Amino acid sequence: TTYADFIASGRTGRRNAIHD
Amino acid sequence: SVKEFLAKAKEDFLKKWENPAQNTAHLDQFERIKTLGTGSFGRVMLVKHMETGNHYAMKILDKQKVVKLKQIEHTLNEKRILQAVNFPFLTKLEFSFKDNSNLYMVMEYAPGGEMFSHLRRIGRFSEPHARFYAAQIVLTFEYLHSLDLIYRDLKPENLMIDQQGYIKVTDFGFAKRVKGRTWTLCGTPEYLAPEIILSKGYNKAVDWWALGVLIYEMAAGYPPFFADQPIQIYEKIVSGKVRFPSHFSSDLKDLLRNLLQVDLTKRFGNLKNGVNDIKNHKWFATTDWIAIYQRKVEAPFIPKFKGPGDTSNFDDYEEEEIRVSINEKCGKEFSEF
Numbered sequence A: 001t002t003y004a005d006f007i008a009s010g011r012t013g014r015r016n017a018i019h020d
Numbered sequence B: 001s002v003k004e005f006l007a008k009a010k011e012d013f014l015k016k017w018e019n020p021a022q023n024t025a026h027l028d029q030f031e032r033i034k035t036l037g038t039g040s041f042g043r044v045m046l047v048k049h050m051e052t053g054n055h056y057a058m059k060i061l062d063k064q065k066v067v068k069l070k071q072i073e074h075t076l077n078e079k080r081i082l083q084a085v086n087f088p089f090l091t092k093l094e095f096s097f098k099d100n101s102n103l104y105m106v107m108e109y110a111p112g113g114e115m116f117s118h119l120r121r122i123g124r125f126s127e128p129h130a131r132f133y134a135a136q137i138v139l140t141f142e143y144l145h146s147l148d149l150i151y152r153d154l155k156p157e158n159l160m161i162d163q164q165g166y167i168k169v170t171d172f173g174f175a176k177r178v179k180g181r182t183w184t185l186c187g188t189p190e191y192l193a194p195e196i197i198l199s200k201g202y203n204k205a206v207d208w209w210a211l212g213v214l215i216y217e218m219a220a221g222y223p224p225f226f227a228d229q230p231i232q233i234y235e236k237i238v239s240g241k242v243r244f245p246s247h248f249s250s251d252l253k254d255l256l257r258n259l260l261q262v263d264l265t266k267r268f269g270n271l272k273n274g275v276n277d278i279k280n281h282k283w284f285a286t287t288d289w290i291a292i293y294q295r296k297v298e299a300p301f302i303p304k305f306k307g308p309g310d311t312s313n314f315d316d317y318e319e320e321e322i323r324v325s326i327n328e329k330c331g332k333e334f335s336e337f
């Protein structure tokens, strides 16, 4: 499921802003 | 009349924009209690103002680290904007000041914690719950955009819950006062408009795209474009495809199709009728906008209260010293702060 793929991903924690 | 409130708000803002408040307190006036979050060039602390006993959130920026990260102009934007603005769902800048080592911004403390924390734990929000928060963002952007401000970092990580269960938008590190286009590649990967990814000049429309992502993520429990690496996410965002969970209502799907629209001429919020396309959408039909502004409508969730300086809705971080060098760092760079 899409939920399970998200929860297994490395991007469920606080996400950093991008920059240079 | 929205128009009249906004005209008056712009008069209030410009006065403070053209003559920004400066050096309105000092470190020793505050008791430092706990770190509420920590990151690259700065952290945020719960502090107590000793002369009043009021609790505030104090953001501390290491001037040398801001320089290294090329965030000087963006940091001066943050403070100049925050001291000038005034809106119920923005965190009020009460004081600002600097010393040899650091920049300080003292804001109202929101004891309910980050939307991020609650969204992740609960898994997802019901559509009414999500709609309640979304309305407050819709009004905040209406306010900010009327002042020619672009916000540029909407996400659950940057939305605080107050004691009454209403939102405070915080983190104005990338906020900018621009009439026309701007080009900076900034924001958070999941939330970037196609424009930004494709190095186009862009405008406030990127904020309304970011609203679409937020609403989706609030209602689904995960964002519309995710992957393990940023590049994979950007490929999804530019593709022009989005799947909605079967539980998404017809109206929700339709709001999001119009918000997450790669075509600027069709993106809601960016059309001839402006923000009212959003405000008058069927999904918001139950929304009483004035009642939301007056914070008269009941929160679908009210945080656990345990005193004035309770930090239990925030995570724990290692406490690190606030050290003040005997030598002034980066004096010229931050002269106007």
Ligand SMILES: NC[C@H](c1ccc(Cl)cc1)c1ccc(-c2cn[nH]c2)cc1
Pocket: A014, B036, B037, B038, B039, B044, B057, B091, B107, B108, B109, B110, B111, B157, B158, B160, B170, B171
């Ligand atoms: N991104 C919000 C920032 C923060 C949170 C967590 C981490 Cl790890 C780093 C930075 C933050 C900003 C403002 C406030 C706050 C709370 N009440 N008033 C302001 C808390 C956290």
